[PDB]
Amino acid sequence: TKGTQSFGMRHNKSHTICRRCGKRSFHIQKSTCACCGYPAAKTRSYNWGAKAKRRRTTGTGRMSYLKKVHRSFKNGFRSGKPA
Amino acid sequence: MKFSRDVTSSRRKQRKAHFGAPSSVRRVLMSAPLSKELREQYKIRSLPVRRDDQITVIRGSNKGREGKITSVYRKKFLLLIERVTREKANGASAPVGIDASKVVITKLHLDKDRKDLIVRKGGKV
Amino acid sequence: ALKTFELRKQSQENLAEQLQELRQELASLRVQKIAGGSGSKLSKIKTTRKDIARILTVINESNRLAAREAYKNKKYIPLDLRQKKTRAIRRALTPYEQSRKTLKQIKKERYFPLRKYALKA
Amino acid sequence: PTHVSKTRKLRGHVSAGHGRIGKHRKHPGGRGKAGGLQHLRSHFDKYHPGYFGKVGMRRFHLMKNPLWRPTVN
Amino acid sequence: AVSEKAGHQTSAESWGTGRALARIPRVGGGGTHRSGQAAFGNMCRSGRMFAPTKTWRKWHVKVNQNEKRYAIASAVAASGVPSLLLARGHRIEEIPEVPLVVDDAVQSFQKTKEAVALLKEIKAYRDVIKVANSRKLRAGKGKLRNRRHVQRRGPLVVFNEDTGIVKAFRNIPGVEIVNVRRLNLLQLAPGGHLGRFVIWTKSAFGLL
Amino acid sequence: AIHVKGQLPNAHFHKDWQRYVKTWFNQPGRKLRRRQARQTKAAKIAPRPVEAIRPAVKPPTIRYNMKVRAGRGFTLEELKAAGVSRRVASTIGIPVDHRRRNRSEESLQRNVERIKVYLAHLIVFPRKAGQPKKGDATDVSGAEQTDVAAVLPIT
RNA sequence: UUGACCUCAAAUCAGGUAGGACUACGCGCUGAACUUAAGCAUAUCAAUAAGCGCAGGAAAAGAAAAUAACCAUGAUUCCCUCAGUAACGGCGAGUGAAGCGGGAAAAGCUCAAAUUUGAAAUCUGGCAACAUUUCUUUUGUUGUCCGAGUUGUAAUUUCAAGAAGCUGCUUUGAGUGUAGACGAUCGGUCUAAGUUCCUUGGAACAGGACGUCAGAGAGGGUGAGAACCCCGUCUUUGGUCGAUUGGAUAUGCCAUAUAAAGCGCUUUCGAAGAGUCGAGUUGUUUGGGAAUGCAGCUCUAAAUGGGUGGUAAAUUUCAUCUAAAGCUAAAUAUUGGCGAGAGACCGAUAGCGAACAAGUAGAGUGAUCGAAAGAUGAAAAGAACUUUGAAAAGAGAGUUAAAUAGUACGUGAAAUUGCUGAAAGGGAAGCAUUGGAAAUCAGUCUUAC
RNA sequence: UUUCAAUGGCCCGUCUUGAAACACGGACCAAGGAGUCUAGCAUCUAUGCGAGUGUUUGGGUGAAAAACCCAUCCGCGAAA
RNA sequence: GUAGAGAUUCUGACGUGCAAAUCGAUCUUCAAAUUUGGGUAUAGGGGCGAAAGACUAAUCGAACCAUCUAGUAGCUGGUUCC
RNA sequence: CAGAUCUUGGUGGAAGUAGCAAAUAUUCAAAUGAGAACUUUGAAGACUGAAGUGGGGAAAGGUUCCAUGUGAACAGCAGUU
RNA sequence: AAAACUUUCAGCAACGGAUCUCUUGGCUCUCGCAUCGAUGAAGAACGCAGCGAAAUGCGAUACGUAAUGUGAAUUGCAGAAGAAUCAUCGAAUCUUUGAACGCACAUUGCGCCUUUGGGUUCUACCAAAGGCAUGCCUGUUUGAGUGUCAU
Ligand SMILES: [Zn+2]
Domain ranges of chain B: 1-125
Interface membership of E148 toward B (CB under 8 Å): yes
Of F35, F49, F38, nearest in space to F92 by CA:
F49
Taking a C-beta distance cutoff of 8 angstroms, is the pair C29, C40 a contact? no
Half-sphere exposure of D64 (CA within 13 A, CB side): 2
Nearest-angstrom CA–CA distance, E42 and E48: 5
Taking a C-beta distance cutoff of 8 angstroms, is the pair E197, E90 a contact? yes
Q: Within chain D, what is the greatest distance between any pair of CA atoms?
A: 63
Close Cβ partners of C101 (under 8 Å, ≥ 6 residues apart):
C109
Q: Is E87's CB less than 7 Å from nucleic acid strand J?
A: no
Whether residues C39 and C88 share a domain: the answer is no
Whether residues C68 and C108 share a domain: the answer is no
Whether residues C21 and C58 share a domain: the answer is yes
Interface membership of F8 toward D (CB under 8 Å): yes
Whether residues C96 and C52 share a domain: the answer is no
Residue C113: which of F91, F122, F143 has the nearest Cβ?
F91
Angle at C79 between CA C75 and CA C85, to 5 degrees: 100
Inter-chain residue contact D47 with F5, CB threshold 8 Å? yes
Domain interval for residue C14: 1-75
Using left for φ > 0, alpha for ψ between -120 and 50, and beta otherwise, residue E73 falls in alpha
Tell me how long chain E is.
208
> From residues 31-60 of A, which are strand K contacts by CB within 7 A?
31, 38-39, 41, 43, 56-60
Q: Within chain C, what is the greatest distance between any pair of CA atoms?
A: 95
Nearest-angstrom CA–CA distance, D26 and D31: 9
Q: Which residues pair with E137 in a beta bridge?
A: E149
Q: Is E147's CB less than 7 Å from nucleic acid strand J?
A: no
Inter-chain residue contact F2 with D51, CB threshold 8 Å? no
What Å distances lie between residue F99 and A5, E124, E185, F75, CA to CA?
89, 70, 53, 8
Question: Technique behind this structure?
Answer: cryo-EM
Q: Protein A8 CA to nucleic acid I31 C1', in Å?
A: 29
Residue pairs between chains A and C whose CB atoms are closer than 8 Å: 6
Whether residues C47 and C17 share a domain: the answer is yes
Tell me, in angstroms, the distance from the centre of ligand 1 to residue E28's CA.
24
Nearest-angstrom CA–CA distance, C46 and C42: 7
Whether residues C116 and C91 share a domain: the answer is yes
Taking a C-beta distance cutoff of 8 angstroms, is the pair B69, B84 a contact? no
Chain centroid to CA B78: how far?
A: 8
CB neighbour burial string for C59-90, b if at least 16 within 10 angstroms, e if fewer = eeebeeeeeeeeeeeeeeeeeeeeeeeeeeee
Alpha helices in C1-121 (DSSP H): 4-8, 12-35, 39-70, 87-91, 95-98, 103-111
> What sign results for the dihedral spanned by CA atoms C32, C34, C37, C42?
positive
Q: Are strands A26-27 and E198-201 parallel, antiparallel or unpaired?
A: unpaired
Q: Pick the residue from chain F with its C-alpha nearest to C114.
A: F91
Nearest-angstrom CA–CA distance, E94 and E96: 6
Neighbours of E46 (CB within 10 A): 15
Alpha helices in chain D (DSSP H): 41-47
Total of domains in chain C: 2
Q: Protein C64 CA to nucleic acid G97 C1', in Å?
A: 67
Nearest-angstrom CA–CA distance, C9 and C61: 12
Those chains having 3 or more beta-carbon pairs within 8 angstroms of chain E are B, F
Q: Which residues pair with E27 in a beta bridge?
A: E12
Q: What is the DSSP letter of E190?
A: G
Question: Burial level of E172, CB count in 10 A (0-12/13-18/19+)?
Answer: buried
Q: B13 vs chain E: nearest CA distance in angstroms?
A: 11
Neighbours of B30 (CB within 10 A): 20
Nearest-angstrom CA–CA distance, A58 and A37: 17
The verdict on whether residue A33 carries a ligand-binding annotation is yes
Whether residues C92 and C56 share a domain: the answer is no
Nearest-angstrom CA–CA distance, E160 and E202: 8
Indicate the SS3 state at residue C104. helix
Amino acid at E1: A
Taking a C-beta distance cutoff of 8 angstroms, is the pair E85, E197 a contact? yes
Which nucleotide is nearest, taking the CA of residue E55 and each C1'? Answer: K28
Taking a C-beta distance cutoff of 8 angstroms, is the pair E79, E197 a contact? yes
What Å distances lie between residue E129 and E88, E101, E133, E152, E154, CA to CA?
16, 21, 6, 10, 9
Over its C-alpha atoms, chain F yields an Rg (Å, rounded) of: 24
Close Cβ partners of C13 (under 8 Å, ≥ 6 residues apart):
none
Tell me how long chain D is.
73
Nearest-angstrom CA–CA distance, C112 and F89: 9
Nearest-angstrom CA–CA distance, E37 and E35: 5
Taking a C-beta distance cutoff of 8 angstroms, is the pair C114, C108 a contact? no
Neighbours of F112 (CB within 10 A): 21
Taking a C-beta distance cutoff of 8 angstroms, is the pair E128, E119 a contact? yes
Nearest-angstrom CA–CA distance, F87 and F135: 14
First to last CA, chain D: 46
Residue pairs between chains B and E whose CB atoms are closer than 8 Å: 8
First to last CA, chain C: 75
Neighbours of F57 (CB within 10 A): 18
Residue D29: which of F1, F8, F61 has the nearest Cβ?
F1
Q: Is B75's CB less than 7 Å from nucleic acid strand K?
A: yes
- Range A66-72 contact pairs with CB under 8 angstroms and sequence separation of 24 or more: A69/C86, A72/C85
Amino acid at F127: R
Of B7, B40, B42, B22, nearest in space to B117 by CA:
B42
Amino acid at A2: K
Contacts of A69 in chain C (CB under 8 A): 86
Q: Which residues pair with F69 in a beta bridge?
A: F57
Contacts of D32 in chain F (CB under 8 A): 9
Q: What is the DSSP letter of E147?
A: -
Nearest-angstrom CA–CA distance, C55 and C46: 14
Q: Which residues of A have a CB under 8 Å from any CB of C?
A: 69, 72, 77, 79
Of B76, B68, B77, nearest in space to B105 by CA:
B68
The verdict on whether residue A36 carries a ligand-binding annotation is yes
Whether residues C21 and C80 share a domain: the answer is no
Amino acid at C11: S
Q: F107 vs chain D: nearest CA distance in angstroms?
A: 22
Nearest-angstrom CA–CA distance, E108 and E88: 30
Indicate the SS3 state at residue F88. helix
Using left for φ > 0, alpha for ψ between -120 and 50, and beta otherwise, residue C25 falls in alpha
Cα dihedral value F94, F96, F101, F107, nearest 10: -10
What Å distances lie between residue D20 and D13, D15, E203, CA to CA?
11, 6, 71
Interface membership of F62 toward D (CB under 8 Å): yes
Nearest-angstrom CA–CA distance, F54 and F148: 9
Q: B1 vs chain E: nearest CA distance in angstroms?
A: 8
The verdict on whether residue A21 carries a ligand-binding annotation is yes
Question: Burial level of E122, CB count in 10 A (0-12/13-18/19+)?
Answer: middle
Taking a C-beta distance cutoff of 8 angstroms, is the pair E159, E204 a contact? yes
Q: E204 vs chain B: nearest CA distance in angstroms?
A: 26
CB neighbour burial string for A42-67, b if at least 16 within 10 angstroms, e if fewer = eebeeeeeeeeeeeeeeeeeeeeeee
Amino acid at C21: E
Nearest-angstrom CA–CA distance, D2 and C101: 68
Over its C-alpha atoms, chain B yields an Rg (Å, rounded) of: 17
Those chains having 3 or more beta-carbon pairs within 8 angstroms of chain B are E
